[PDB]
Amino acid sequence: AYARTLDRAVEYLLSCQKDEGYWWGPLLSNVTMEAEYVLLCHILDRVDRDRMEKIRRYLLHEQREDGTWALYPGGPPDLDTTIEAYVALKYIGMSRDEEPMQKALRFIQSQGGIESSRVFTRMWLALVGEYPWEKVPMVPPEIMFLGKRMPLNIYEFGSWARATVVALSIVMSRQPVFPLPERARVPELYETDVPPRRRGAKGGGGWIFDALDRALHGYQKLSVHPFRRAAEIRALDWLLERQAGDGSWGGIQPPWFYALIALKILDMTQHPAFIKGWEGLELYGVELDYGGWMFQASISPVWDTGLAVLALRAAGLPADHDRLVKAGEWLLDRQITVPGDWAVKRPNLKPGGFAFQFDNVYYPDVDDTAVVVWALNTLRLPDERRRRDAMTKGFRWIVGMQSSNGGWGAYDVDNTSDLPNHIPFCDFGEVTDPPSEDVTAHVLECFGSFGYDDAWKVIRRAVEYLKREQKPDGSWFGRWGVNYLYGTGAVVSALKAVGIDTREPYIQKALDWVEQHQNPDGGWGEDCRSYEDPAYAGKGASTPSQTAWALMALIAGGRAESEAARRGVQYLVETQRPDGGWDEPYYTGTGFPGDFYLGYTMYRHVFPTLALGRYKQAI
Amino acid sequence: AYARTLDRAVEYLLSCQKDEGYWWGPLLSNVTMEAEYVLLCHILDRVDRDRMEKIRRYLLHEQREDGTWALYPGGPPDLDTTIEAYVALKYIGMSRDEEPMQKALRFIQSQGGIESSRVFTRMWLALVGEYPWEKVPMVPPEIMFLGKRMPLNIYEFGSWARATVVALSIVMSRQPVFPLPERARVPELYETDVPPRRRGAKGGGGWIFDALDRALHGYQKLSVHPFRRAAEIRALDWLLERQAGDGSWGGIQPPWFYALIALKILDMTQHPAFIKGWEGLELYGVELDYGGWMFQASISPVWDTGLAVLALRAAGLPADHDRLVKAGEWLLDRQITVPGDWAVKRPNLKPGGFAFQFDNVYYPDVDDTAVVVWALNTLRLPDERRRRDAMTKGFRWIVGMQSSNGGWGAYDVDNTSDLPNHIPFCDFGEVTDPPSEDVTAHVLECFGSFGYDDAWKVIRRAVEYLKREQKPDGSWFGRWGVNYLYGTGAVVSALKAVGIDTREPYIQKALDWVEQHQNPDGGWGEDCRSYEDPAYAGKGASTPSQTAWALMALIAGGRAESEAARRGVQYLVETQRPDGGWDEPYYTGTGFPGDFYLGYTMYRHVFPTLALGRYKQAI
Numbered sequence A, B: 001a002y003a004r005t006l007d008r009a010v011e012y013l014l015s016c017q018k019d020e021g022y023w024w025g026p027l028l029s030n031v032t033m034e035a036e037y038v039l040l041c042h043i044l045d046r047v048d049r050d051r052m053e054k055i056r057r058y059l060l061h062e063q064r065e066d067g068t069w070a071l072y073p074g075g076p077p078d079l080d081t082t083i084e085a086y087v088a089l090k091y092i093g094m095s096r097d098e099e100p101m102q103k104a105l106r107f108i109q110s111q112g113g114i115e116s117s118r119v120f121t122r123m124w125l126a127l128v129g130e131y132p133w134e135k136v137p138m139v140p141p142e143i144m145f146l147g148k149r150m151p152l153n154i155y156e157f158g159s160w161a162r163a164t165v166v167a168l169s170i171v172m173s174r175q176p177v178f179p180l181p182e183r184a185r186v187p188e189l190y191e192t193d194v195p196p197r198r199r200g201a202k203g204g205g206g207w208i209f210d211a212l213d214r215a216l217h218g219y220q221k222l223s224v225h226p227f228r229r230a231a232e233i234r235a236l237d238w239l240l241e242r243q244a245g246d247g248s249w250g251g252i253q254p255p256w257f258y259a260l261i262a263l264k265i266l267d268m269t270q271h272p273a274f275i276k277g278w279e280g281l282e283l284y285g286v287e288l289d290y291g292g293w294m295f296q297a298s299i300s301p302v303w304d305t306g307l308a309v310l311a312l313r314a315a316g317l318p319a320d321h322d323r324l325v326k327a328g329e330w331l332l333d334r335q336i337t338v339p340g341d342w343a344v345k346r347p348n349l350k351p352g353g354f355a356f357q358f359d360n361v362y363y364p365d366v367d368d369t370a371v372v373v374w375a376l377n378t379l380r381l382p383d384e385r386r387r388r389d390a391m392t393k394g395f396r397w398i399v400g401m402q403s404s405n406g407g408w409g410a411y412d413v414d415n416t417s418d419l420p421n422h423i424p425f426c427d428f429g430e431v432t433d434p435p436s437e438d439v440t441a442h443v444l445e446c447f448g449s450f451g452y453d454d455a456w457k458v459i460r461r462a463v464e465y466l467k468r469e470q471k472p473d474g475s476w477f478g479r480w481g482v483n484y485l486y487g488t489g490a491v492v493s494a495l496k497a498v499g500i501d502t503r504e505p506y507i508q509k510a511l512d513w514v515e516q517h518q519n520p521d522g523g524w525g526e527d528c529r530s531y532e533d534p535a536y537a538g539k540g541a542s543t544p545s546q547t548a549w550a551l552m553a554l555i556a557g558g559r560a561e562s563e564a565a566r567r568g569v570q571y572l573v574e575t576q577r578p579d580g581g582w583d584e585p586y587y588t589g590t591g592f593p594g595d596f597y598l599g600y601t602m603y604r605h606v607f608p609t610l611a612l613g614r615y616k617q618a619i
């Protein structure tokens, strides 16, 4: 029945593998990357007419009928995103009249204008001089002086926020302005009557931070700020030290862009770090066939390759397949062997993790490290010596990274401070990196492949963690994947791997929940709205990926021979394309619950293959 | 008569000009660059068999009949140089028997072995584990803590020493060892009876420093050194901030190599700066036609271009000659506009100088800046706006760089501290950058071209300086050129340009001295020995360059219609080659009086052309 489906999928994936041996699908996000790029280019005075053109086509192509852009396909119009896409287009050339410009503009206004947008958006505008700097939450260079164990020192923030903050303190310190030509001025973003409905800090705003901020803008005005020179240089140095090998900073769009703006501010455009930072950008861009151009929020080579391998193995290929070997060898060369920021809380921990992108040594993550080590574990590479050793180093690093609550975070250990969530600046996405059910789950399944079970105290503390986090209806949240279907699939699959008993009440209470959400069409789906409003948990148009996740939960829970089970396998077998792949016009990846979603291009092909491989296994 | 010589020199120079518009002859030094390269490669575990081969050819090619190598062609055998060339060859493959290895080994031994070599040499050996680190003068990371106005803070050293020290403190801090394979071990360098005649600090050693060194070696042994981690990071940061655009540090071989070793030490080979540092190296290498390969101590593009222009103009070409315009435009794009280390002593001075190499913004020098600004002054470029502007910024920067005594140093203002000259480490070349007669002279001739004269207080203080420095016999020392002929030519030419009266006693006393040294052949020459022993001042085989310098002195002093004058012009006319160039198997450039000499490849062609142009002018 499905056997042909699997064979078509296996050969499809294999054709997607690059020559070097890895897989790498693009990462989709939203138009703020490209819009911010255009502004970045203006700031750096490096505008390429031809590129601007490709970016316009893309911006438009992404606008919907109503004239707005969203955070995810088929999602509500987003104001920040739309405001930025708007300014970008006006800069590139479009007059405020044009049909597209008109719709967007009115959407923007009906929302309360620019005054209703997030900090970043108003800040970007502040940079080109279309918004007052005084109204932008202040992050001072001096933050650089807080010690390792002090409130709000840069290590209390999550890895992604940390670098962005450091980079920004240099910029906010100078509050620079790079004027837009008159043609692109956007005063009309203020022309509205609607009350400006302002978004506040992620966790709530104590009047302290509010006062403190007012203080800082006050202090900004003084004619002299002692030790500020040093605070700046501390920040600059912090950055020079961590620049990734591709020229980026963290391998993510924000800090990278800001770090470049900061360098420009410090007259360092003639410096190596800048040059390398600037030209590294091309590697993240993507030429779209319809003549457009997009910029990736980040890149997922390692991750893509790790999963690809696991799926192809579960599907049936030999642990020594000359093609999976290319992958294994490649993965071995990726292992990070030097201390990263994680070592501030684990100085005696030997380096052994892996990063998400190609070359980003200071920020390996537990998720990638667990998937890579595990996928390696399932292979037979020529140099069993290195495979043995690498797995070992990786294994140890993971174990050492476990947090207090028994669960793993992504980049740090106990990065659970609640302080940062209340600052006036932090009104967008996550700002700290606490442990999550999905990473913890993946870690568990990794150990599981080795044998380690419930006996080992490590695994026990984790399961304890998971049990305490389970939801009333039996589901598990999805921090990095959309959403409860992602988490629940991850957890149950994990628990099953570490020997727990699938028959337990809480396990069954989950397996039921899965079955109860199956869509009429035989597959499963969960819209991104499920982060915003609970009515959507387990609800949404079916996707190949989310179906594969729900299936894994079932197959792990013994219900592989169920109705819902076979029904789902039907859905995957049917919807498969003639080439062997699948389609997925929806995002199933999570950047930040509620604020940033991602489209993992390979998911639609890898998870179905993985779930089908595990089904063929249960028979 | 000479006119044909002049036309042949002109067309020759023009044929040497690169397409971009500049001139760039290689800079010759000695084999320690290549020998140290080989060791650097071994340390960085990046040995390329083919390159080693080209290097071996070169090293032998440079060895003399006695089996030794020297600091300059036709110079005495140098121990340090020979010891390093020796180890290099043994590493590359040659067995200690071979004719060459034999001769060298006995020379080295007859000198007292390795114990008689400079700090650097023993240090390099310490790095590959063939010499004890305890016996190597110590330079601690903590030096990084000394303030701007404290004894021995890094800004009391000359620019070149400064970066080398900073880079080295990280290395000496870890006292790393990268073992040589048994084949290349060199114990035989100890096998000698001759008493080790040790070289001491350049200025004598106070028992204090000796004590201090012994202290620092003991401190090294302790199990804990508080704040050392920081000193290291202060150093690394100091380094990361100043990396030049080509990946070098300062555009000179020493700090560059050391900075790379330090990053290797700090597990930063995967960092941008390291990679940029490593690949930048190729730009300094040179393929020799006989299959050898050499590495330049530094590169002289700007300098070469600046002089080339002045010579071609003095020769006759139109101030708007399209070929001289390519040069002018190119020179304008070179001007440094950001603060360098010089700003520590001149914070309110607007950037406007030029560097010696292509891209080295933090270290412009007064010599290049005076020659470039002056050459620009003699051209009519399309964008008179920028030429007017560049000259002014440059001019002002020079004026602002003037030191206390009224003369100019090369990179800093009053870098005259005598302290650094007494440390156990500083036993090679210059370590501070005090004002010199030749740079001062060039600066003067630069102002002269604008019309400024003896009336202006700045020029007066300089002439005062020069007069006070003149030698008893009427000659002027040559800090950056070999030697009294170079200086005297520079000063008299300068004084003549700022309006001083050539008839004065001291001027005549010099012009006489010049005539007094003319060789039987009609030209002038001065061997590099003239730094070591005074009997050689103004004596040596005639060279096209030194003849040209003596000529300029005469032509500036009015004796252009003299015997010695016409006689000299004959020499240049006769010895010219058919293509229009000249030959010069001797070095006429000075790195450090007594310790490091340079072969400026373009000198032989540019100065004769410049002197002949000024002769044709005096008629």
Ligand SMILES: C=CCN(C)CCCCCCOc1ccc2c(-c3ccc(Br)cc3)coc2c1
Pocket: A160, A161, A164, A252, A253, A254, A255, A297, A298, A303, A356, A365, A367, A368, A410, A426, A428, A429, A430, A431, A480, A481, A591, A596
């Ligand atoms: C399933 C597993 C995935 N894991 C391997 C983790 C790697 C996926 C994360 C890639 C998302 O890239 C980003 C990261 C941060 C941002 C931000 C941002 C927002 C607020 C602050 Br303050 C700082 C940064 C914006 O876009 C991003 C994209």
Ligand SMILES: C=CCN(C)CCCCCCOc1ccc2c(-c3ccc(Br)cc3)coc2c1
Pocket: B160, B161, B164, B252, B253, B254, B255, B297, B298, B303, B356, B365, B367, B368, B410, B426, B428, B429, B430, B431, B480, B481, B591, B596
């Ligand atoms: C006419 C004008 C030339 N001027 C424009 C000045 C530029 C020429 C200098 C190039 C010489 O390059 C170097 C510099 C330093 C060293 C060292 C060294 C010795 C001791 C310490 Br402590 C540190 C470095 C060795 O070789 C060099 C070559």
Ligand SMILES: CCCCCCCCOCCOCCOCCOCCO
Pocket: A241, A242, A339, A340, A341, A343, A344, A347, A362, B229, B232, B233, B236, B266, B268
């Ligand atoms: C250079 C001194 C050595 C200090 C590094 C040891 C690391 C100690 O853990 C602190 C964590 O700091 C994170 C550093 O990674 C960034 C790059 O720093 C470069 C070289 O150390």
Ligand SMILES: CCCCCCCCOCCOCCOCCOCCO
Pocket: A229, A232, A233, A236, A266, A268, B241, B242, B339, B340, B341, B342, B343, B344, B362
């Ligand atoms: C970050 C504030 C800028 C402070 C430096 C300007 C002050 C003058 O320089 C003092 C000495 O440093 C000179 C060296 O230039 C090297 C790199 O500095 C680059 C970024 O500041």
